[PDB]
Design a protein around this ligand. Structure first.
Ligand SMILES: [Mg+2]
Ligand SMILES: [Mg+2]
Ligand SMILES: [Mg+2]
Ligand SMILES: [Mg+2]
Lengths: 315, 315, 315, 315
């Protein structure tokens, strides 16, 4: 139409509401350019003119440094933090997973991009330490799901806002404003293929869902295998998504900073819940930028059910 | 690329080996066009001003009438068969599902298109009864996956070929030729929430997958909920896919003619297997165009293992 | 919509009207794939990952050989004719200009693709001689204009049909059916920058248009500089387009087979006129496949005016 | 490309050298989005269900209001100025022509978008009078050509930069940096059909172009009829472009503020010239926002030669 409400307009508007400097708007525009390019790359993965995780990491990194908004960056496919050139520093710390779960291009890719944005609190010259914040300090968080439509979900204080990429103009158009997740769902999501390294809490919760004690309808099961896809489904349809310990640690597999914290934040801003079993995910204070966390997230009543089973039939 | 290998070029060149008439190529270009339109519609599902399955059915039906290659069409969202006007009548019979597994305008849509192509054999006037052919007689069959890339998997007598949609030119490009599924996989795919209603064969097989007897690694679980995505993953990665039986589905939920048979055909054509427990899906002779059938398909050793269990009638 | 009338449908329909073998339909599908690829290339000429005339020639050539419809091909950027592999011969001779007027990619390209299709009359093994036909024998002719929209204009016996490329699905959609050009126009098109190697006929006609003897409104002047653009404008708006002798020969500059004949044919099928001054363009029998012809084409009354000035105030 | 040079990145990086506020970047992203939407609309001009100039005006106006960077907007298809609501009010004044030279739904459309960006200088409340600034004070100016590729020519204090639209990602990419027009050209551009009404200066210059005195080669003629295309050709190839005076235009047809001034600014910024015969276009001080002005612009030696003739007041 003639009054197209794009992502950049939306961020500019709640940012004018917030009397801010618009540095975050530059940051999110850079992210959007990276996401559009990654989307069109995944488009045509099997027409090789690969290395897609590396190329996505580089693309995101350069756009963020060129945003004039970031000063410390953290990546899944990079080892320690990267201190943005003083020539182009900003007030923001970004932890991101450029690309998650891919590299069988020739007939299949299932991918998404996760990010979280914290403001820099200290006044020291920046280092790794500035990215070591608890997830409750996030200024913004979100993901881009590369599916049958390229979609950006973005969480801020007003809540969670839906965006779909319009290929005809190459802009993200807002779809849903103030997204809320259902109180209780009908779908659970976890890799049951393990099932033998599980906590008895995980087993008894799954059993409650497969053989309901009220003789009610059993929960449907869904597990795409790429995190962002499962989490997005759990945000749209309602339900619970589970990645517990499973022969890794009492700390799970997904990384806290760039995979668990942004999802926890989107979930919380949509009204859902996100725990590790012991403490809420957003309350974990990290000590390594690459440290893993167990994650049980989703609809509030379903996560409360899991926490009851953890309180009684677990350990 | 000055030597683009398009799907139309592909059918046109494997069809001169068989000394055909050229009607299959016209039919497949018609499906090509219909699928491309559907994929863009899915592109902008929340941007473009619902009812995607009836629009998809009408579009596919129209393009198939205009190919001058069909006489009988059968569609999932249409009750009885449609008999092509004689001015537009070819020799083929198409059993197709335009769209399967979608409908959310807030955000997520996950869907594909399935088709199988018979040749009319009887000298009667064309009618519904000419669709009731065993899957072993399919001339060609396959599916379009509307995922992060739009993909056409086409199976014929010589085998299975993978086609990606280059969105810059609007044609489908050959990616993998003569695809073959692994003999043994490490992924099992089914809706375990229905585990109440499993007859004991499936439960034995699945507990064997999670708790292997020979101390080898367990299988990972994967289940998207859209058949096209799940069968595509089974083909691309190897494994097994199950949708056998519930209390709400004594016969199974999937439809033999336009869902079970095309996937089973692509499967045996990729070196894999596809059973109902009792008989191979391709050897089933249908009696209603909408009749249902249980399906277990995938890598040969996995389907054979499930069949070992099934024939044993174990605990 | 759900009844999209594409180029392939249209050619299939007037081809079923003509009881033909559909070999021409294969030919035009191959042409369309070449045109879509060329269009997307010109799209992004200044994002070099050039040689565009060579690459366009190769693309068109390979698609035509892979159409199973052609046996002799002629190109602007190729020296003699190319005899299609017997493995993939057809009944048709194609003379084409793959690309006309380009190669300043870095900030500007103005281009189109011309083609004419004659049926092979003789029964000799094919050679250059089969492309040496007068333009009145054309079975099909047309052009693709690469502008603010990619457009294919196609002339056959029913007349001239308009087609625009829909990027969202990558198919050409019919726009105008049975195009006719105005009886008399208001625009003339020729490179007045020469003006000193002109025939007195050309000068007095141009003067009649600039200083009208009836004190009527003078003709507007338009000269894009790329032939297909000027000819398309002359087909849409009405007028006259001129390329006479001009220090080259009494035979002009544009090549007869692939630039002058197809335009003459499109013009004639739209109701306009196309002359060399002496004989009608479509009546010239060529003796070299690369021979030049003067060309005055456009609306019938405007070309008749030119021919009156040629009959009286010329030589 | 992992280091994409976008237009937004470009403005954002040449704006930190000047220690600006960032409002120009927001304004130019707004124009970026509006132009991309317009270019797709033009894409499908005959496919998509007229009135492109009012739609273009409304779209550009809306995106400029939403940038929070403008206070006064002036548009060719709008009578008096528009004063931006204070909640959306920036410091800049934009004089723009959304669309110029189009409207055929059968087929051809040939058009561009022009803009020039002033800074409000007076301490009055914003109003129409703040648009009446001499072109020598433009902060930035340029045009979008909607041709065979969509192109944005942006001129600022440092010079002129060329941007192409990559349609796969929906951003504008830097192609040529610091463009410079040739000193002397071989192409003259004007509507010679109006030759009746030429005051003798133009006729002398043009007869000098066709019949050079020093036995050197004559200039080629080029005239598209859309100003943006013609001025783009003049810049890219070198030459001269004329639209001075008719009997239906004692002042000329072109509009100073949104047509003449942006092109003249891009021109002097590319090392070229732009006059009215009497004065440089950039040094003209306007009195009506819709006032007209004659223009002669292009390569410096060609405009200087025309000025030699003009000052001589020759035959
Ligand atoms: Mg990861
Ligand atoms: Mg179905
Ligand atoms: Mg040529
Ligand atoms: Mg205008």
């Amino acid at each position: 139409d003639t009054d197209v409400n794009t992502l950049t307009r939306f961020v500019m508007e709640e940012g004018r509401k917030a009397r801010g400097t618009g540095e975050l708007t530059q940051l999110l525009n850079s992210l959007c350019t990276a996401v559009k390019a990654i989307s069109s790359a995944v488009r045509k993965a099997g027409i090789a003119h690969k290395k897609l995780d590396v190329l996505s990491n580089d693309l995101v990194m350069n756009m963020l440094k060129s945003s004039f908004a970031t000063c410390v960056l953290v990546s899944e496919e990079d080892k320690h933090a990267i201190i943005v050139e003083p020539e182009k520093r900003g007030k923001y710390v970004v932890c991101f997973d450029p690309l998650d779960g891919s590299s069988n291009i020739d007939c299949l890719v299932s991918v998404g991009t996760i990010f979280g944005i914290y403001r820099k609190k200290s006044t020291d010259e920046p280092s790794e330490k500035d990215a070591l914040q608890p997830g409750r300090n996030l200024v913004a968080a979100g993901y881009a799901l590369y599916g049958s439509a390229t979609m950006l979900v973005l969480a801020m204080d007003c809540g969670v806002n839906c965006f779909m990429l319009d290929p005809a103009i190459g802009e993200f158009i807002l779809v849903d404003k103030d997204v809320k997740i259902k109180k209780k769902g009908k779908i659970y999501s976890l890799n049951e293929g393990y099932a033998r390294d599980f906590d008895p809490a995980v087993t008894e919760y799954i059993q409650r869902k497969k053989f309901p004690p009220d003789n009610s309808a059993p929960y449907g099961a869904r597990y795409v295998g790429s995190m962002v896809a499962d989490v997005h489904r759990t945000l749209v349809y309602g339900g619970i998504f589970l990645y517990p310990a499973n022969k890794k640690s009492p700390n799970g597999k997904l990384r806290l900073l760039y995979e668990c914290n942004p999802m926890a934040y989107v979930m919380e801003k949509a009204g859902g819940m996100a725990t590790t079993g012991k403490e809420a995910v957003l309350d974990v204070i990290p000590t390594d930028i690459h440290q893993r966390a167990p994650v049980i997230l989703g609809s509030p009543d379903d996560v409360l059910e899991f926490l009851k089973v953890y309180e009684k039939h677990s350990a």
